[PDB]
Specification:
Chains A, B, C, D, E, F, G: GO terms for molecular function: identical protein binding; toxin activity. The structure is a homoheptamer. In chain A, about 0% of the residues lie in helices and about 30% in strands. Chain A has one helix spanning about 165-170, and strands at about 15, 15-20, 25-30, 30, 45, 50-55, 55-60, 65-75, 85-90, 100-105, 115-120, 170-175, 180, 195-205, 205, 230-235, 240. In chain A, a hairpin with a 6-residue loop joins strand 10 and strand 11 (about 115-120).
Chain lengths: ~240, ~240, ~240, ~240, ~240, ~240, ~240
Amino acid sequence: ADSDINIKTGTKTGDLVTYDKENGMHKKVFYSFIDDKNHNKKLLVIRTKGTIAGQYRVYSEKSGLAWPSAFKVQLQLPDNEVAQISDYYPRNSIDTKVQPDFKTILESPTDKKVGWKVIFNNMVNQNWGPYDRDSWNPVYGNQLFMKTRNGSMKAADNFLDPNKASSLLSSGFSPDFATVITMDRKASKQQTNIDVIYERVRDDYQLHWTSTNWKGTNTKDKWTDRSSERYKIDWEKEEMTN
Amino acid sequence: ADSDINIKTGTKTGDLVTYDKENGMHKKVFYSFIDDKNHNKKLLVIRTKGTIAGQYRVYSEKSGLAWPSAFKVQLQLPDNEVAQISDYYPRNSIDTKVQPDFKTILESPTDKKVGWKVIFNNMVNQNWGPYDRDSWNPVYGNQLFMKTRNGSMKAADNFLDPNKASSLLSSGFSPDFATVITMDRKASKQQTNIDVIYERVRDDYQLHWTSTNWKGTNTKDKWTDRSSERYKIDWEKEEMTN
Amino acid sequence: ADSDINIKTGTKTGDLVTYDKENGMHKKVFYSFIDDKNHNKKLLVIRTKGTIAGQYRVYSEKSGLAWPSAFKVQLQLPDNEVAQISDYYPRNSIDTKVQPDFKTILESPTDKKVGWKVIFNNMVNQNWGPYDRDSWNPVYGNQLFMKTRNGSMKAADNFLDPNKASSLLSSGFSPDFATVITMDRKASKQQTNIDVIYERVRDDYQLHWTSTNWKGTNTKDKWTDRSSERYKIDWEKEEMTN
Amino acid sequence: ADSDINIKTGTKTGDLVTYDKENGMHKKVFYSFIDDKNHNKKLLVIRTKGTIAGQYRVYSEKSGLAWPSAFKVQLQLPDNEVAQISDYYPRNSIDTKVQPDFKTILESPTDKKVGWKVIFNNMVNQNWGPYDRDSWNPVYGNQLFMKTRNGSMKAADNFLDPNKASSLLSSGFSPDFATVITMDRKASKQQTNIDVIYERVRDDYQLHWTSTNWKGTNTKDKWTDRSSERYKIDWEKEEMTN
Amino acid sequence: ADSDINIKTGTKTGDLVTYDKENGMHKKVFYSFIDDKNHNKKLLVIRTKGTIAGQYRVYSEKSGLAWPSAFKVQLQLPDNEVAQISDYYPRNSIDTKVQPDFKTILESPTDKKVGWKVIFNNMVNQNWGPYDRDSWNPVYGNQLFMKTRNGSMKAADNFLDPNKASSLLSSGFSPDFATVITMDRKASKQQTNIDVIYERVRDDYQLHWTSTNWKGTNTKDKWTDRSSERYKIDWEKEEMTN
Amino acid sequence: ADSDINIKTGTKTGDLVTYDKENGMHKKVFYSFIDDKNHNKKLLVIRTKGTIAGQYRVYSEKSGLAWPSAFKVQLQLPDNEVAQISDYYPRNSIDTKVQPDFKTILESPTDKKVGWKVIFNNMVNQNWGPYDRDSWNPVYGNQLFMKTRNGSMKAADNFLDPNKASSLLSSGFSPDFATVITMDRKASKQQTNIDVIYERVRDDYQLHWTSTNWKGTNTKDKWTDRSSERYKIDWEKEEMTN
Amino acid sequence: ADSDINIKTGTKTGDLVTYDKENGMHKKVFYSFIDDKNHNKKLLVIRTKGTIAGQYRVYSEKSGLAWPSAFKVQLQLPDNEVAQISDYYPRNSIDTKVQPDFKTILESPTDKKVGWKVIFNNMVNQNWGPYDRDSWNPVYGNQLFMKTRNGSMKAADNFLDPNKASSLLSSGFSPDFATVITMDRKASKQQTNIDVIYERVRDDYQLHWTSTNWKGTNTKDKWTDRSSERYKIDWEKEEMTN
């Protein structure tokens, strides 16, 4: 810190939004242009705010339930242009020594690519061992959504209550993430292009009655809504658009 | 966070009231603006403050118990208007790892409807287990309001006192929630419209005696005092008026 | 919250006193007017402060023991006037997971009625057991005020000292509560009445010695020294009178 | 609170001193005013900071052992005067769930009389449990001041070291409390009087020897070296005068 | 603590980026100055955010597994220049008594070089023993990467899930460390140089089946992506441009 | 807590040192003055920081070990003067029940005398029990300064490590304590005098080889190295000097 | 704090560096002169910053292992000069009852000698037991760098890896301490010298071999490569030249 190293104190906005219907995945960005001209480059923080609904839906009617395996959100840009990607508040941090049920990873961010993976880490239901996005339990398969042990009603009805499950699976997950874009200032022309994906890595989960002690089977990333969204970031005017 | 990105740091109010005599629900909102020449557009903030009384009463002479299963508030709007919905604090925070008695949810918010279900999760009754909203037991059924085990007086007098139960069941739960909606600044037209379907998802607790041990039963959604009170937002005047 | 919403801005005073000799009812209403032109209303913060004396005493000698069952403050208001009860702290907060002795509840309120009940939710006597008011331990009835199990003097001189008991019951409880009232500013007539009833639920306790191993009973709600009061709110004069 | 009610804000000194020889206790007060056009009335603060030397002394040579049972500070005023006691900190607060060894209560304060008794709730001697002023060990009586169990010298020397005992007993307790008194400013007459009490309610613990296994005996509140000191505060001149 | 020393408290930016396609590690620095007539000289802060992808990737197809072991970002300057390294953070600090997975260290810093090592103190796999970077389980070898202690598919498929491992093994680790230098002001000559050797000392892990239980083998420092980068800090013009 | 009482808030320096060569006594005082147009009298602060050598040393070799039984500090003034002693930050605060090695005390401060007792409440030797200023371990005497169970060399060398023992013991202790003097401003006379004592109440601890294990004996308070310094304070010119 | 004494908190710069080759000690100082005429004298505070390398180096091939036994950095001035030593942030604080590995005590100080010894009070090797600077075991001797309880490779190769040992041993320790000096203002002559004697108390750890369990030995303070330094503190010009 500044005091820790004897440093004394060295050290215009807008709120875009959109939404996808067939997929069902909300979107938003909040940008800032504090206009201190004394800084080298224009700084822009892309708050990935939105709502990727849980889509915790029983599509198959045996009965299959589609659930969110990954709210992967990532910013990618073409090669020809001149800008670069610099920073991101959500960072893979040294896991010191709790096991949170969703692990906010950041894909290995190669220059011009920063991608978070809001993964479904080990989650506890009905007071037993937990299970993650790739939860595959030799007895209950993906043991995400078994309402009880000894159910008696219809299989399609006999799904873990969306209320009892982790609140992200039922409603969805709102990303609280940020990353930034930078380059030298004095270049003649400034513009980039982005490719957002809000990949709700959909995960088909066929729940079926096999015999006596219930059993689960799951298929990883069986579907997906790589709802590839493109934003149009207008850096000169200090506005962000699509 | 803000320091983690090494940024220097840089990125009119009123009130309302109304009550329902039949259903007994108090409703309020509060707003605030800034005249920020740097910010893009106008922002209005909706606080859901109010009092959805539990009406924890023995209406029917087991007892039928009109208790609030899940107060729910939804700020829903017609499609035709040009508005859009942005932020919904509180969000479903990553279930991080505590079992709160009312686990608030942000039901899967489409771009147009965002609605919490501040549901009734576990409640400890007379030094025993969780007993969530849909708490339902083979023998004792739901277990919200079991005054005691070995009662001896009239059953109508044998219902858990509101004082000992969760303080929300007795006297309701004041919603402490908020959200905001957005739109471009340079649009000619302004008008919007709200729904605010205040809900009190009533539910029943029937303690029926077997002659060997008490039981319970739950008639979920036996009523719903969903006193839908659509609100009116007066945006240009920088006022909110019902 | 406000940062989670990304906004940086959060979205004339006095005092009074009065006493009652018969029942010792002190009242204090330190108040505030914000002289804010950005606000379209007036606030009257009601510091619910006073001396609701414990009156822990052996009123009659066996010897009956009067003590505070439930301190309450009900800021009741006449209906004809146009005022309305907007907000209030404390609130019935979501139970989370501690069992405090005095459970500050907010009785089922309405536009006109807001009632706290500062109920007695337990105490430990001689380092054994959480004994509350609604606690009826037929072996000891309400276990509030027994100094020791094996007394040997006159019964009247064997009741729990005002010191060892929970300091609230005997020395008295001081309320720390508030509730706000609001109404539109453009009202033609500026005046509304009020009726705040300070009410302590004194509880009879005919503590008597039963000759085998001490056994008590607790007759609830014998005496209730309900004390009213009025404050005239002169909004036109920007003051509150009486 | 204030923010919880959705509001931002809205709401000349002296250092007296005095002491007494025979009783041996130190005394002092502090105050402060304000000048607000917005506020109505006038406020004042009285802090009872001082030093009441516990007199942990072997008064008689068994050897009679004087010690401070009940430190107290109590402010009382004549009736005919027009003033009233408004506020006071600390307050008898709600027990939650620790047993502090020197408890502080606020005896039932009439509008005129307010008093604390900073009670000796316990102390641990050689790590064998808690014992208050009204401690009565059936074998060690009030077992505040036994140095050990197996002494061998003159009994006048086998008394607890002030060092090991609670730091208040050895050298007294300094009150850190305060009260408040208020009145309307537009009064023709502006005078009152006070009666402080620094009643170091001592307690004879004449500690003898019973010749089988040391046995302790106490006589509660034998004397009181209650200075009963009477103060007079120079209210009118915006000062306090000795 | 300035208060502990008894004294009342008392006492231009930019950014860059560059990427390597073969090795693939992002780089970054951020600086600050004050025009302080109280400080004798200027200061720099060299933040080393960057990003070093882990390359937790199967190199040999048994099947080899390249992965990052220690991100030893170090900074060093030519001897001839008048520069000398003054301060740095983090500092090797006293370890009280937690074993954080990555034990960041500052290599023995001579006055010319200050080099941090981001080693893996220990990582936890499938809820059993911890496993350091230079961990060597004589049977399970290094233990950073084992999808299961009992697998059945192709060996290349049976390597630890990158998501399950520490979020720094799979997606790499971006250091948050910094250091500074401080040169006299009166000097006639004002330039220096730097060499920053970003490091990814990629270590191998091999699970070679022994026919009785899985057995692991590792080759310390089998490679290194010593990007061996070389920066050119433009000290003179109150920038860091290159 | 003035905020707890509903009010907003509870609304020339130097230094000296002089050394005692024989006793190794380092002594300091710090002061602060303010010209407040609101306070009634004058203010000053006396902070006895100083520093007291340990004197862990074999002055004579059982073997004598003159360790600091009691760092003590006590300002004292002549009787005739008009001054009085009022305030002091360190206090015999309620031991809110946890056994510090040095429990600092404030000896019963008369109006004239305020005296602290920085005493040895305990410390641990080779991972065993606590032992205080009067640690009278009938086995090891003062169990403070005893090396080990079975030292075999010349026991003039077998003495507890001055490093392992509590750091206050060998390397000395520095008081961090303060007190204050108060008087009216209207008096014609402006004088005061002091009588400091820094009695590092020395001790003697001497192990004793009785038969097989070790036995100890300590001649408490054998030397009181009373560095009885007679400080002088020049109040009128707002300076302390002597 | 100041509030407890009832007070409203009424209480040119530069930097250096240098280094040595053979022993490898990096030394410097940060200082601040407050430009306030208010303080009686000139304020100068010395921070002992720098890195005294570990020299955790196997010089001889057991293995003679010279390690930092204590970074006993001192500070002393010529007697003839007139200045005095007063204050220092890191004290031998009351060890206020956890035992850390390094304890940075402050030697018994004087008006001329004030020196810490950052000793190796403890450390944990491979999770079997504690081991200190005086770590000696009749078998394992010291246990700073016993890599294992058994190794099959060459002893010069068999010695704890620097990474696993406490980060201070391998790389080195950087003092973060400070110290103060004092002298009156009115003095005619205005200069003084200083003798900063940095230090690295080297110490040897050797692992002897008994052929059943390895043995260890330690040679105390074989080297004390006590580098020296005599800062030329130019107080008047407000610079610590060198």
